[PDB]
Design an enzyme around this catalytic site. Structure first.
Site, PDB file in Angstrom:
ATOM      1  N   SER A  11      43.711  31.645  40.979  1.00 33.43           N
ATOM      2  CA  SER A  11      42.465  32.083  40.376  1.00 33.43           C
ATOM      3  C   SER A  11      41.213  32.017  41.290  1.00 33.43           C
ATOM      4  CB  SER A  11      42.253  31.286  39.102  1.00 33.43           C
ATOM      5  OG  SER A  11      43.436  31.341  38.314  1.00 33.43           O
TER       6      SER A  11
ATOM      7  N   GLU B 294      47.270  39.219  37.000  1.00 36.79           N
ATOM      8  CA  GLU B 294      47.651  37.948  36.433  1.00 36.79           C
ATOM      9  C   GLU B 294      48.712  38.157  35.430  1.00 36.79           C
ATOM     10  OE1 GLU B 294      46.976  35.028  37.049  1.00 36.79           O
ATOM     11  OE2 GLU B 294      44.950  34.799  37.765  1.00 36.79           O
TER      12      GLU B 294
END
EC number: 3.5.2.6
Length: 266
Positions: A43, A141
């Site tokens: 992230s 993601e």
């Protein structure tokens, strides 16, 4: 004594590979430990992603509503599922992507960036406009936390990501109003309390963006300010490939390495 010998001791204690970079300043030397080895973004990329979106569009673009459905919601997403009915603005998505690492939000922003690979190419392009010829994003993601050790896809290096974050927050890569929005979101991050923040004394200011994945992956990239206002950039990345995909990330490792950094900048 020697700071490198200490980072190696941390590696042995936590059974992990550790990467640390602190860019040089007028008065301090660069801090390096495996600064040029590749580690997964996880992230940490959502921070420069927000800058890429801000850069490519006028402030009015934050007001744009974006709609999505439950099939769009994948990966850790504390903010996005509470707004499938209503949709979220580009601005709210930026807020979510940074302060809560909302993965769905990271994907919509990549989609907003445009082009092949859901935005990954546009994004890597954006990193290139900042001199970063090493980092790359390839998947969205969550596939992007899952690449095996040695695979270069979805990776950066401490040296690279530190130099990007420095351009974004302390440099002139973004005009002041946009720079301020980015700086503030990272300042009010909720996911990083037990990483770099934990290692610096409380009277140092710390803004950050975290990253976590499989293979014991734990990252934190941060901008810190000494008690008298002197800024530094700090990138700390770790993994534990020894233990396989199911390896536990160890946040205390990032915090300890950060304390070592604080001691050297003090």
């Amino acid at each position: 004594a020697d700071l490198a010998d200490r980072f190696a001791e941390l590696e042995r204690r936590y059974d992990a590979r550790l990467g640390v970079y602190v860019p040089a300043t007028g008065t301090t030397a660069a801090i390096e430990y495996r600064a040029d080895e590749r580690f997964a973004f996880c992230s940490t990329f959502k921070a420069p992603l927000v800058a890429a979106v801000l850069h490519q569009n006028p402030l009015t673009h934050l007001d744009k509503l974006i709609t999505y459905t439950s099939d769009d919601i994948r990966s850790i997403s504390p903010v996005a599922q509470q707004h499938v009915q209503t949709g979220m603005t580009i601005g709210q998505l930026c807020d979510a992507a940074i302060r809560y690492s909302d993965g769905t939000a990271a994907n919509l922003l990549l989609a907003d960036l445009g082009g092949p690979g859901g935005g990954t190419a546009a994004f890597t392009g954006y990193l290139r406009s900042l001199g970063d010829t090493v980092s790359r994003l390839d998947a969205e993601e969550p596939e992007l936390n899952r690449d095996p050790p040695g695979d270069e896809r979805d990776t950066t290096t401490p040296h690279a990501i530190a130099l990007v974050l420095q351009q974004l927050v302390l440099g002139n890569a973004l005009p002041p109003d946009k720079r301020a929005l980015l700086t503030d979101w990272m300042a009010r991050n909720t996911t990083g309390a037990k990483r770099i923040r934990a290692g610096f004394p409380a009277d140092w200011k710390v803004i950050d963006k975290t990253g976590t994945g499989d293979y014991g992956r734990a990252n934190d990239i941060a901008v810190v300010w000494s008690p008298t206002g002197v800024p530094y950039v700090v990138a700390v990345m770790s993994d534990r490939a020894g233990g396989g995909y199911d390896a536990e990330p160890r946040e205390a490792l990032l915090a300890e390495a950060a304390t070592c950094v604080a001691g050297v900048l003090a």
